[PDB]
Enzyme design. Structure first.
Site, PDB file in Angstrom:
ATOM      1  N   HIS A 120      39.657  30.470  35.047  1.00  0.00           N
ATOM      2  CA  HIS A 120      39.526  29.015  35.091  1.00  0.00           C
ATOM      3  C   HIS A 120      39.984  28.339  36.399  1.00  0.00           C
ATOM      4  O   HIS A 120      39.477  27.267  36.733  1.00  0.00           O
ATOM      5  CB  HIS A 120      40.280  28.405  33.909  1.00  0.00           C
ATOM      6  N   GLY A 148      40.960  45.238  36.193  1.00  0.00           N
ATOM      7  CA  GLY A 148      39.601  44.799  35.934  1.00  0.00           C
ATOM      8  C   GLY A 148      38.518  45.787  36.334  1.00  0.00           C
ATOM      9  O   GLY A 148      37.455  45.832  35.715  1.00  0.00           O
ATOM     10  N   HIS A 150      30.365  36.033  29.196  1.00  0.00           N
ATOM     11  CA  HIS A 150      30.319  35.491  27.839  1.00  0.00           C
ATOM     12  C   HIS A 150      29.281  36.164  26.939  1.00  0.00           C
ATOM     13  O   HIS A 150      28.936  35.633  25.881  1.00  0.00           O
ATOM     14  CB  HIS A 150      30.075  33.984  27.879  1.00  0.00           C
ATOM     15  N   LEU A 176      42.319  39.004  31.213  1.00  0.00           N
ATOM     16  CA  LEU A 176      42.397  38.931  32.669  1.00  0.00           C
ATOM     17  C   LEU A 176      41.202  38.195  33.278  1.00  0.00           C
ATOM     18  O   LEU A 176      41.262  37.753  34.426  1.00  0.00           O
ATOM     19  CB  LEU A 176      42.517  40.337  33.273  1.00  0.00           C
TER      20      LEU A 176
END
Ligand code: HEM
Ligand code: HEM
Ligand SMILES: [C]OC(=O)[C]C1=C([C])N(C(=O)C234[B@@]56[B@@]78[B@]9%10[C@@]2%11B92%12B7%109B857B925B673B%11%1254)C2=[C][C]=C(O[C])[C]=C21
Ligand SMILES: [C]OC(=O)[C]C1=C([C])N(C(=O)C234[B@@]56[B@@]78[B@]9%10[C@@]2%11B92%12B7%109B857B925B673B%11%1254)C2=[C][C]=C(O[C])[C]=C21
Ligand SMILES: *[C@@H]1O[C@H](CO)[C@@H](O[C@@H]2O[C@H](CO)[C@@H](O)[C@H](O)[C@H]2NC(C)=O)[C@H](O)[C@H]1NC(C)=O
Ligand SMILES: *[C@@H]1O[C@H](CO)[C@@H](O[C@@H]2O[C@H](CO)[C@@H](O)[C@H](O)[C@H]2NC(C)=O)[C@H](O)[C@H]1NC(C)=O
Ligand SMILES: CCCCCCCCO[C@@H]1O[C@H](CO)[C@@H](O)[C@H](O)[C@H]1O
Ligand SMILES: CCCCCCCCO[C@@H]1O[C@H](CO)[C@@H](O)[C@H](O)[C@H]1O
Ligand SMILES: *[C@@H]1O[C@H](CO)[C@@H](O)[C@H](O)[C@H]1NC(C)=O
Ligand SMILES: *[C@@H]1O[C@H](CO)[C@@H](O)[C@H](O)[C@H]1NC(C)=O
Ligand SMILES: *[C@@H]1O[C@H](CO)[C@@H](O)[C@H](O)[C@H]1NC(C)=O
Ligand SMILES: *[C@@H]1O[C@H](CO)[C@@H](O)[C@H](O)[C@H]1NC(C)=O
Lengths: 551, 551
Positions: free
Chosen positions: A357, A495, A176, A353
């Site tokens: 959660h 990723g 984040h 991607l």
């Protein structure tokens, strides 16, 4: 009407309209030639039949434990193999960046405007007959139906790799800082203009916020003491804007770099830990350089913490995710003798991607309490109640959920998952198989192949009709996982290069930066090169509690 | 008080305070070791006694006309040697960038803040006893006295290389897209946040300005027709902010990408020329792509014009400046198999050294008129009077002035020159010899060696007392020129790497960009690869007058 809607060009060849009904493919340095760049060159064929599939490499890296046990104890071999690993993830990401949500062609606007997320694949043109181009029906299936049928969790599915809440919250907290969507502009825009690991979630995006967060003494950040414990300062004390519900008391409105870290106590935990770490590093540096002023101490501390961050992400976080027996090593020097652009632009697909959660449990177990989502959200009084030590000891014990495999998205955040679909359609994402071809992966020929399962595959076949119309995100969430692993092939193979550019692309990994004097001398350099999650917690949490990314 | 004030670390070693009275030099990857990094390695010794001096290479490239006449006709040899030349200017500039005016040490603030000019050498610390560090007196000599004694022009000194006004104005015009000092913040700050050749001086720094300058039809820029000739639009028509004296009529307030280009008719000439070029390329692309929309036409045209700019700069501009018999070649593919960072941050010293005001003549001669500075400045009615054709024809004939050799700065801009001194001291520039060592040049041992002359050297010795206290900019202006050349050694060996990073560091030179499809196909690519100042003038100036960068 656009003759490039079918995405005819293969092998990263570029499609260009040459009239209303004709196209041409640029096959420059693709290793291929022909109309749609499908005819391989000699060297291309040679490199083709000698290239191992990602599953083979993964198998090798997760087996033969003794061989890797010998390799990890030989610095030369370990460095060589790590260099190979780094190399395998290179040349997959466009750097300098190219397309974004508004430009399916290269332009100076797409390159210079840092407000955009960049795009690994160009968006589907607006005048295309179908959402994916020319394949599929006029409209994609109901996102709610997709969500409810193959994404929503019936019963909690634990991660077979044994990931815990320390890992989950570390992932949220760490990501984040560069995944900060500007919802005022749109899903394809970001507020993180640094486009990488700058620790703005600790120090603030702007200079004024940083100054409001700083003590301007000994290089440290402001902090308060509650019950003898160090915590971030309040909004009232710093005038630092934070996002909190109006019913949150002032003494519980902690102010940190990222304005949304008040959302989860798990985030505030890591915020506090990293704060304490910054001030610790400031103490060490001050002891090393008594002739230094506040500013230099602060800056040097920041660089050091960036180093620690990258170190921990590579050798603990990714080390745990990988399941590799080979010990990954953070060492910029391995890239000095090779071509590598020390720059990065955060991709929208990278954001998409990383919506992991399914990691979230139904309840959050701390000490002897089980908090619901309603009780846990925006509740720092929980953190003050149990303390950092108990939080670490508890999050270390509670197991996280499996991300791939399907049907493990917690109901509490269903609205989020649906958004991830809707926004993906809003940004005109290309299909799953397109993104697989973009990263040199074999396209799926059926839904059963995608899931490795018959039920969800049948549901998805009912919803999408064609496998070539399957969307990226839900495919990522329902994909057949690796043997007893948390992820599938697509998640990792997409990723990993993004992560490479986002970590090693950092300027501190550049030859002019990667030296002792950058970090205040050999001591700071050592602080970076000996960093670990266990050492972070041990140095900043009372009692030095055991911690790990696995249960 | 700072132990690093004397700049002890040699060979690009980094100095760090290790206490109030002690320091340490980081010699990492410098090729040297020892206390101040003066003790060379074996390989370093080998590379040192085999490296030719810049004057030797300059001699070899400026002589043997027959040999180079053979080389320029063999593509292999030319590509090889050009690759060598490109390589020789590499590994000199920090990329990603490091220091700026406020940071003599590496920090995230220095790296991330684009408002700063970067610095090739760190500024002298504030608590240093002397302006240059520890050498010299308490204060540098009076800038007015330096100006009047060795800088101000007595009699006009013509350029022996025969540079003309087309060249001078092309230099000003081209450089003023990345040299845009934010005087509101300070001399160490820039308004060119793109930090390179983005043609913002044509399209505007921001999106709003650009949109105000655009026609939104066929990708073209807005324009007006005066006397049958195409000129930039007015401020009244576009509401674009320009800088003009209050007495300038509204119909003469032309609006262009750069807000200051209306102050000099020489700049307005090139603004017009490049405008016309943009619209022409728009026409060509529109013919090639009748299915394209306004936006893509605009962006593609922009990229193409960037290409043309770099092409012309290398093969005509720098080609003229160098005086080489070897024909320089613009080809990004020469760097595709080498380590090169496709990014750039504009350095303050680069800005300082490019103050080539001695190029300016005593009067501006157009057709049969001789305009003084007072008559020429802010007077675009001259341009409308004579027209673009006569402007080119006249500026091509009129010779510019020599830059090195001393005493050639026109009095009309003395206040500028003085500023260049004052601000240089405001930004705490290190000495001339420190910058010479920084760029692998031998330090001057006297003022006579610097000037190659007795008088000016005597004045400078009377002013500065010590050669190691001599400042950078005036030294650049009074340096002994190469035989019948416009510049001295320092100007070239400092300007060339900066220019390399500023030209080849452009993203359009990167492998993912450098392909036909980026520029709308082979046609636009050909427009870039066949660009020249002659073709630029011929395509857009009526009558197609002959032009060149020399008389
Ligand atoms: C209590 C735990 C969590 C909650 C309540 C939560 C909730 C949310 C919410 C509300 C959003 C924003 C949706 C939107 O703006 O449209 C979001 C975004 C996101 N979440 Fe989570 N999340 C949690 C944990 C995690 C975890 C563990 C990860 C794993 C890495 C994660 C990754 C993300 C990402 C990548 C985004 C996209 C954010 C952006 O682009 O700005 N979250 N989450
Ligand atoms: C044609 C007449 C010219 C005039 C009247 C002129 C005048 C000026 C002035 C007033 C400044 C600003 C100085 C300050 O603010 O302290 C300046 C800056 C500059 N000039 Fe010139 N100049 C001319 C031509 C040129 C030429 C031919 C060049 C070299 C190509 C040049 C290079 C520069 C540079 C590099 C700057 C600093 C730019 C910046 O930092 O913003 N100028 N000039
Ligand atoms: C989000 O991506 C992830 O899910 C994490 C992840 C990364 C990253 N890698 C890597 O391959 C890397 B990244 B880092 B480190 C190691 B080195 B360095 B870059 B090179 B590359 B190589 C892997 C490899 C295997 C697995 O599980 C199967 C997961 C991951
Ligand atoms: C202001 O700087 C200048 O004075 C312009 C300039 C540049 C630039 N070079 C270069 O050496 C370069 B760098 B860049 B470009 C041109 B090509 B590309 B790299 B290759 B190499 B070659 C030279 C070489 C010699 C001279 O004068 C004798 C001037 C210049
Ligand atoms: C980057 O692009 C965005 C979108 O094109 C720009 O944001 C727009 O700015 C204009 C003003 O110039 C507004 O009228 C629009 O409403 C904005 N759109 C959105 C979606 O925010 C932004 O200004 C660009 N950034 C830069 C630095 O040029
Ligand atoms: C880049 O640095 C400059 C200089 O430090 C910043 O501008 C300063 O900003 C503060 C506000 O935080 C002002 O009070 C100062 O007056 C400004 N100084 C000057 C001379 O401009 C600027 O904000 C920085 N840019 C970024 C993006 O952080
Ligand atoms: C050079 C060839 C070495 C081969 C080593 C064994 C690699 C076997 O790789 C296999 O790939 C499969 C792909 O689906 C996976 O499902 C299996 O788990 C894996 O064992
Ligand atoms: C150019 C007009 C301003 C210069 C006069 C004030 C500075 C005087 O300067 C002198 O100029 C003499 C004549 O050029 C030189 O011979 C001397 O070296 C110099 O000191
Ligand atoms: C790929 O090329 C073949 C022949 O070269 C052509 O028939 C086919 O239509 C192309 N693919 C697309 C999607 O147009
Ligand atoms: C916040 O947590 C505390 C436990 O410390 C609990 O008593 C309280 O009810 C929680 N708040 C909400 C709104 O559930
Ligand atoms: C360079 O090193 C020598 C010997 O190590 C020392 O005498 C000298 O003082 C150093 N230079 C400076 C500027 O201190
Ligand atoms: C501007 O130039 C014109 C000639 O084109 C001249 O008549 C006029 O006097 C000039 N203006 C000034 C203020 O010198």
């Amino acid at each position: 009407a656009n003759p490039c809607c079918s995405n005819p060009c293969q092998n990263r060849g570029e499609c260009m309209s040459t009239g209303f009904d004709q196209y041409k493919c640029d096959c420059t340095r693709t290793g291929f030639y022909g109309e749609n760049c499908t005819t391989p060159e000699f060297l291309t064929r040679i490199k083709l039949l000698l290239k191992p599939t990602p599953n083979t490499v993964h198998y090798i890296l997760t087996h033969f434990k003794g061989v890797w046990n010998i390799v990890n104890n030989i610095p030369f071999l370990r460095s060589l193999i790590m260099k190979y690993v780094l190399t395998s993830r290179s040349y997959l990401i466009d750097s300098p960046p190219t397309y974004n949500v508004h430009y399916g062609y290269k332009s100076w606007e797409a390159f210079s405007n840092l407000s955009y997320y960049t795009r690994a694949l160009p968006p589907v043109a607006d005048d295309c007959p179908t959402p994916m181009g020319v394949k599929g029906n006029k409209e994609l299936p109901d996102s709610k139906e997709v969500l409810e049928k193959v994404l929503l969790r019936r019963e909690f599915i634990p991660d077979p790799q044994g990931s815990n809440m320390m890992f989950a919250f570390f992932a949220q907290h760490f990501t984040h800082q560069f995944f900060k969507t500007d919802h005022k502009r749109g899903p394809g825009f970001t507020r993180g203009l640094g486009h990488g690991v700058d620790l703005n979630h600790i120090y603030g995006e702007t200079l004024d916020r940083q100054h409001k967060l700083r003590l301007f003494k000994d290089g440290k950040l402001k902090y308060q003491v509650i019950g003898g414990e160090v915590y971030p300062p309040t909004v009232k004390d710093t005038q630092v804007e934070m996002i909190y519900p109006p019913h949150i008391p002032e003494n519980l409105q902690f102010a940190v770099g990222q304005e949304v870290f008040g959302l989860v106590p798990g985030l505030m935990m890591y915020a506090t830990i990293w704060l304490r770490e910054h001030n610790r590093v400031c103490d060490i540096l001050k002891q090393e350089h008594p002739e230094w002023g506040d500013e230099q101490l602060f800056q040097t501390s920041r660089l050091i913490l960036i180093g620690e961050t990258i170190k921990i992400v590579i050798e603990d976080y990714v080390q745990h995710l990988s399941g590799y027996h080979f010990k990954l090593k953070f060492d910029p020097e391995l890239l000095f003798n090779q071509q590598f652009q020390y720059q990065n632009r955060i991709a929208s697909e990278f954001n998409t991607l990383y919506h992991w959660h399914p990691l979230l449990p139904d309840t959050f177990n701390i000490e002897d309490q089980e908090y619901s989502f309603k009780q846990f959200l925006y509740n720092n009084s929980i953190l003050l109640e149990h303390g950092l030590t108990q939080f670490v000891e508890s999050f270390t014990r509670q197991i996280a959920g499996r991300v791939a495999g399907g049907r493990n998205v917690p109901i509490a955040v269903q609205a989020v998952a649906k958004a991830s679909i809707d926004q993906s359609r809003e940004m005109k994402y290309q299909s799953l198989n397109e993104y697989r071809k973009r990263f040199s992966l074999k396209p799926y020929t059926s839904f059963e192949e995608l899931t490795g399962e018959k039920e969800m595959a049948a549901e998805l076949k009912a919803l999408y009709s064609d496998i070539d119309v399957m969307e990226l995100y839900p495919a990522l969430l329902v994909e057949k996982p690796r043997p007893d692993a948390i992820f599938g092939e697509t998640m990792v193979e997409l990723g990993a290069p993004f992560s490479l550019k986002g970590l090693m692309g950092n300027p501190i990994c550049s030859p002019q930066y990667w030296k002792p004097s950058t970090f205040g001398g050999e001591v700071g350099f050592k602080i970076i090169n000996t960093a670990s999650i266990q050492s972070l917690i041990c140095n900043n949490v009372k009692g030095c509690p055991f911690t790990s990314f696995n249960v």
